[PDB]
Amino acid sequence: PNTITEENLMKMIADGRGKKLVVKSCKVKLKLRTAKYLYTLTVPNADDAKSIVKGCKDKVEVQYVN
Amino acid sequence: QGNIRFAVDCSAGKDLELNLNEFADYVRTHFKINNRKHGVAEKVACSVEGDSLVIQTTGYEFAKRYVKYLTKRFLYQDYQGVFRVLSTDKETYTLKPY
Amino acid sequence: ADCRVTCRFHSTYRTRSKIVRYKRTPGNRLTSLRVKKLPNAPHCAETGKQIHGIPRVIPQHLTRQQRKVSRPYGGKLCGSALRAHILESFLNEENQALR
Amino acid sequence: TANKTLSRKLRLAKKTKTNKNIPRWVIAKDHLKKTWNYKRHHWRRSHLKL
Amino acid sequence: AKRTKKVGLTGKYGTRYGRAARKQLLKIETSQKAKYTCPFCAKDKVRRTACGIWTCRSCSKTMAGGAYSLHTEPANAARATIRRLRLARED
RNA sequence: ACCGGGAAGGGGCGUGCCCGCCCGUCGAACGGGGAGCCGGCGGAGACUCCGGCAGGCGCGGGCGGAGACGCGCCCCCCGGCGACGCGCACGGGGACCGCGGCGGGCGGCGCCCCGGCCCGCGAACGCCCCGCAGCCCCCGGACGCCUUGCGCGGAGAGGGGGGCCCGGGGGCGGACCGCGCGUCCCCGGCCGCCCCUGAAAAGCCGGGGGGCCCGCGCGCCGUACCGACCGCACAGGACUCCGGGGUCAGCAGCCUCUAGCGCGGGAGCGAACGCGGCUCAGGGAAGUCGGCAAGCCGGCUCCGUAACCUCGGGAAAAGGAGUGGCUCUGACGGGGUCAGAACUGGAACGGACGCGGGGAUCCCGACUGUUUACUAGAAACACAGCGU
Ligand SMILES: [K+]
Ligand SMILES: [K+]
Ligand SMILES: [K+]
Ligand SMILES: [K+]
Ligand SMILES: [K+]
Ligand SMILES: [K+]
Ligand SMILES: [K+]
Ligand SMILES: [K+]
Ligand SMILES: [K+]
Ligand SMILES: [K+]
Ligand SMILES: [K+]
Ligand SMILES: [K+]
Ligand SMILES: [K+]
Ligand SMILES: [K+]
Ligand SMILES: [K+]
Ligand SMILES: [K+]
Ligand SMILES: [K+]
Ligand SMILES: [K+]
Ligand SMILES: [K+]
Ligand SMILES: [K+]
Ligand SMILES: [Mg+2]
Ligand SMILES: [Mg+2]
Ligand SMILES: [Mg+2]
Ligand SMILES: [Mg+2]
Ligand SMILES: [Mg+2]
Ligand SMILES: [Mg+2]
Ligand SMILES: [Mg+2]
Ligand SMILES: [Mg+2]
Ligand SMILES: [Mg+2]
Ligand SMILES: [Mg+2]
Ligand SMILES: [Mg+2]
Ligand SMILES: [Mg+2]
Numbered sequence: 001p002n003t004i005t006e007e008n009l010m011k012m013i014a015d016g017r018g019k020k021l022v023v024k025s026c027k028v029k030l031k032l033r034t035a036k037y038l039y040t041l042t043v044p045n046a047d048d049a050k051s052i053v054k055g056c057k058d059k060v061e062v063q064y065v066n
Numbered sequence: 067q068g069n070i071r072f073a074v075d076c077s078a079g080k081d082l083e084l085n086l087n088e089f090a091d092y093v094r095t096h097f098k099i100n101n102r103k104h105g106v107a108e109k110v111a112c113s114v115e116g117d118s119l120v121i122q123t124t125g126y127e128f129a130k131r132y133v134k135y136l137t138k139r140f141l142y143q144d145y146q147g148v149f150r151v152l153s154t155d156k157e158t159y160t161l162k163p164y
Numbered sequence: 165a166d167c168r169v170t171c172r173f174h175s176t177y178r179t180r181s182k183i184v185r186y187k188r189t190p191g192n193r194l195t196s197l198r199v200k201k202l203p204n205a206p207h208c209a210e211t212g213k214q215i216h217g218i219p220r221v222i223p224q225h226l227t228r229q230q231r232k233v234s235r236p237y238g239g240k241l242c243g244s245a246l247r248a249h250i251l252e253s254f255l256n257e258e259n260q261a262l263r
Numbered sequence: 264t265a266n267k268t269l270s271r272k273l274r275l276a277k278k279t280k281t282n283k284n285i286p287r288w289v290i291a292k293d294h295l296k297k298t299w300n301y302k303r304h305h306w307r308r309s310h311l312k313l
Numbered sequence: 314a315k316r317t318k319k320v321g322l323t324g325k326y327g328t329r330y331g332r333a334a335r336k337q338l339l340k341i342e343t344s345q346k347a348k349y350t351c352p353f354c355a356k357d358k359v360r361r362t363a364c365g366i367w368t369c370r371s372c373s374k375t376m377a378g379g380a381y382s383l384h385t386e387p388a389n390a391a392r393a394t395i396r397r398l399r400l401a402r403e404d
Numbered sequence: 405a406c407c408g409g410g411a412a413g414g415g416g417c418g419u420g421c422c423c424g425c426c427c428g429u430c431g432a433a434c435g436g437g438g439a440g441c442c443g444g445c446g447g448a449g450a451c452u453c454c455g456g457c458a459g460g461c462g463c464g465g466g467c468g469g470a471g472a473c474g475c476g477c478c479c480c481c482c483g484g485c486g487a488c489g490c491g492c493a494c495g496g497g498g499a500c501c502g503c504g505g506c507g508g509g510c511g512g513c514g515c516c517c518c519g520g521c522c523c524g525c526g527a528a529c530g531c532c533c534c535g536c537a538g539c540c541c542c543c544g545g546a547c548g549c550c551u552u553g554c555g556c557g558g559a560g561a562g563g564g565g566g567g568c569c570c571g572g573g574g575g576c577g578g579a580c581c582g583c584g585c586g587u588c589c590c591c592g593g594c595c596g597c598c599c600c601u602g603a604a605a606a607g608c609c610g611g612g613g614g615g616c617c618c619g620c621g622c623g624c625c626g627u628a629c630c631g632a633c634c635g636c637a638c639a640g641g642a643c644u645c646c647g648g649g650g651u652c653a654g655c656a657g658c659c660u661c662u663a664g665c666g667c668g669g670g671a672g673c674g675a676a677c678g679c680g681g682c683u684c685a686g687g688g689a690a691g692u693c694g695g696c697a698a699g700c701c702g703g704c705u706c707c708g709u710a711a712c713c714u715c716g717g718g719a720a721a722a723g724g725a726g727u728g729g730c731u732c733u734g735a736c737g738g739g740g741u742c743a744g745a746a747c748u749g750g751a752a753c754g755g756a757c758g759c760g761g762g763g764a765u766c767c768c769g770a771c772u773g774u775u776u777a778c779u780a781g782a783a784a785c786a787c788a789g790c791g792u
Contacts, residue, residue: 001457001578002530017617035618037530038457040577098518129506132518142513153508166662167500168646172451176645177434180488183590185571186499190526190579191443194499196646197528199590202571206484206610215484215610216540216568217473222485223609224438225460229475231610234467240483240611243472243540266433269625307632320716329771330788332714354559363601371559380599 004039006051012039013056021055023048025065067125072133074151074159075118082148086114092140093119099126134159172196208242215239274313278304322346341381349383352376359383 012018012034022031028048030041043051055061076084090112097106113120121133134151137159141149147164154160173182184196203222206215217233219226232238237246282303290298304311317324322342323335349359354372362368367376367383379385 003577015617036458038578042576101518129518131507135518139517146513166648168648168662171645173434173645175434177643178645179434181436182434183571185590187527188499188525189442192525193442193527195442195527197441199571202591203485204487205569209483209611213539214569218569218610220569220571222438224607226609233473233610234475235473237611239609264433264626265628266626272626308637318715324716326716328714328716328718330714331770334789335714335716356559364599366601371556 001038001040004041006041006043006047009039009041009051010054013059016056016058018056018059021059021061023052023061023063067127069122069124070127070157071120071122072130072157072159073116073118073120074133074137074161075116075154076161077117078149078161078163079117082145086117086119089140090114090119093121093136096136096139130157130159137161167194169194169196172198206239208245209240210245211242213242215242271313275311278311278313345381347382 009030009032012032017034019033019035021033023029024031025045028043028045030043030048030051032039052061076086076089094112095103097103097110099106099109109126110121110123113122137151149161150164152160152162169186172184181201183199185199187195187197189195202220204214205218205220207213208215215233218231218239223231235243235246241249283300284303285295285298285300289295320326320335321339323339326335326338345361348357349367350357351359351369351372351374353374354369356369356371358370358372359367359376360370361381362375364380365377367378368374369376376383379388
């Protein structure tokens with residue numbers, strides 16, 4: 001597992017390298033399941049809005065909160 | 067140090083009879099600070115509101131565990147086995163039957 | 165409490181490659197974890213001192229660039245041994261010929 | 264031992280499998296009065312050298 | 314303050330083995346623990362590492378010598394006589 | 405059957421060339437070895453199952469720096485890793501262990517009690533930062549730098565600024581908060597020691613010279629349980645690993661948390677005599693082949709110690725005195741120790757436990773060591789030394 005800067009996150013999505021994304025509410029955790037590593041990005045909810053709209057329609061998103 | 071507050075709810079203390087002044091009176095005379103009782107009225111004040119004891123202080127802070135100790139001491143007189151003291155929230159205790 | 169553990173390896177004979185350390189797990193448990201032997205790094209062919217720049221990892225696990233130094237005789241000679249070979253070569257040519 | 268060769272495991276496996284009584288229908292079929300199989304063995308008093 | 318009067322380094326032996334042996338060891342063992350001079354370093358840092366083997370702790374040069382001292386008296390004379398025989402070979 | 409090099413002893417490829425001195429896919433379930441962690445599930449299996457997160461080995465779709473140093477292959481030769489002893493101490497990390505706070509839960513309670521007990525958890529692996537010693541670079545040219553100990557310097561110290569290694573730590577991922585004395589384990593730099601100098605190979609890599617992201621897979625065997633083993637079944641014999649608290653010099657003795665709980669069966673009586681124990685007035689070896697057996701001594705601190713001697717010893721020689729509890733004071737840079745004083749108790753204090761009796765001599769063997777497994781441990785054997 002590893003962390004990632006936001007700009008690298010879309011490029012992995014942009015090249016179809018992700019398999020599933022999870023949004024976690026606590027500061028929000030976004031977890032992307034690639035072939036090699038699980039990657040985690042932490043942003044405030046203001047920032048995660050725009051990123052998910054950019055979300056690749058070929059990339060399954062799920063949500064999670066409790 | 068600053069001022070913090072605690073409270074003990076005796077809502078189940080209605081069908082059996084429990085004065086709220088006595089329990090307040092019990093705590094008023096027994097509270098110790100630094101193993102002494104001179105200079106308490108000027109730090110720790112027992113109120114009676116909502117049928118529940120309230121301990122507001124001013125400049126004095128201490129553990130919520132001691133507020134539970136004085137409760138089982140005062141309850142030991144004619145309630146040996148009636149009540150179990152449990153935590154409901156932050157600063158509030160609750161008296162519960164068996 | 166009681167923190168005693170059992171052996172992790174096939175037999176309990178405590179040779180130099182069967183040493184563990186202890187660690188607490190997220191389920192509140194004391195686990196054993198093997199402590200690998202650390203190989204030496206390469207040593208100079210003329211002086212027997214550690215060559216600078218190479219980590220103490222077996223070279224199978226290091227990328228090609230990580231296994232080298234950027235100089236003639238990079239991982240064979242310690243830098244001072246190179247300079248002494250260079251001077252001996254140049255000066256003997258100056259004395260075996262032209263007096 | 265917990266660390267045994269497959270060849271010793273197989274010969275031990277056969278002594279376990281054949282360590283049995285005579286079936287009761289065999290006693291009716293063959294009209295027997297000796298009913299004990301005297302080639303049985305028990306682990307506490309045996310010396311299987313296998 | 315001086316701790317013994319005669320035995321020196323052979324105080325490690327106690328009352329054992331007799332006087333003639335301990336007398337021999339005091340001389341031998343003092344000699345093999347000594348610091349000798351690098352014939353190359355010119356510094357006083359040569360120490361024995363095994364019987365016959367002497368290393369400068371500053372040069373790092375290794376040398377072949379005596380069992381309990383760097384130079385023996387037979388080898389000094391041999392080196393001196395061999396040198397004069399070579400120079401005599403020169404015309 | 406036993407013994408053995410002196411034999412025209414095989415490979416790369418692609419024909420055809422080229423290279424070549426001559427065994428072992430025998431011998432280690434503790435040595436060497438490419439790579440695994442957490443959580444969960446079952447009546448009986450788990451580093452093997454399931455879920456999650458990784459790692460290894462395979463297969464298919466010429467630049468920067470002043471410098472120390474930083475950022476595809478093939479053959480011949482030269483090297484490296486694998487790869488290594490013992491030791492008193494000193495230093496660092498981890499785990500353990502304690503004290504205090506704060507959060508949740510218990511117990512008992514004649515008096516006292518914020519004083520008792522239990523629970524407060526974070527792996528492998530990936531990225532960034534930080535790492536004492538130690539070795540290296542640059543300037544420049546010396547009455548210093550520095551360790552518990554040492555050690556180092558014109559073959560270039562100190563000082564200023566840098567590079568590399570470091571089984572480790574931190575932060576983010578994976579996903580409660582402080583402070584301490586010790587204990588064990590590993591690691592580090594030194595120093596000491598030897599007529600003792602403390603394996604090998606597979607495998608993997610570097611140098612010099614010459615020629616030139618996405619998929620799929622990982623076969624074979626062991627794996628239950630046990631001191632259930634050997635002594636005809638049994639107070640015997642039978643290798644290793646993990647190791648809390650109090651008292652204490654302590655892995656001793658004595659008590660204990662966790663965990664675990666057999667040992668061919670019970671009851672009554674309280675004779676002799678036995679077996680293992682305890683105490684005895686007065687005397688004190690008169691007993692006996694013989695002080696056999698038993699008893700005296702014993703921890704720690706201070707005082708005080710002869711003959712003789714291979715000058716190292718003798719030596720705990722011999723002999724003396726003190727020692728609890730409580731209330732305090734001083735010294736050392738938060739921590740135990742060391743020193744001293746008042747008061748007090750049948751005229752007591754290493755209060756159990758643990759723990760030398762001593763001295764004057766003669767014979768034998770110098771000494772530590774070895775032996776008749778099952779009646780002999782010695783004066784016998786060995787030994788360094790000496791000699792042929
Ligand atoms: K088994
Ligand atoms: K058996
Ligand atoms: K023959
Ligand atoms: K072998
Ligand atoms: K072995
Ligand atoms: K093996
Ligand atoms: K080895
Ligand atoms: K080379
Ligand atoms: K198993
Ligand atoms: K009787
Ligand atoms: K009798
Ligand atoms: K007598
Ligand atoms: K006796
Ligand atoms: K005292
Ligand atoms: K003897
Ligand atoms: K001895
Ligand atoms: K005998
Ligand atoms: K004997
Ligand atoms: K003896
Ligand atoms: K003998
Ligand atoms: Mg083999
Ligand atoms: Mg092995
Ligand atoms: Mg099991
Ligand atoms: Mg070895
Ligand atoms: Mg098992
Ligand atoms: Mg008597
Ligand atoms: Mg007599
Ligand atoms: Mg008589
Ligand atoms: Mg003797
Ligand atoms: Mg003896
Ligand atoms: Mg005998
Ligand atoms: Mg005997």
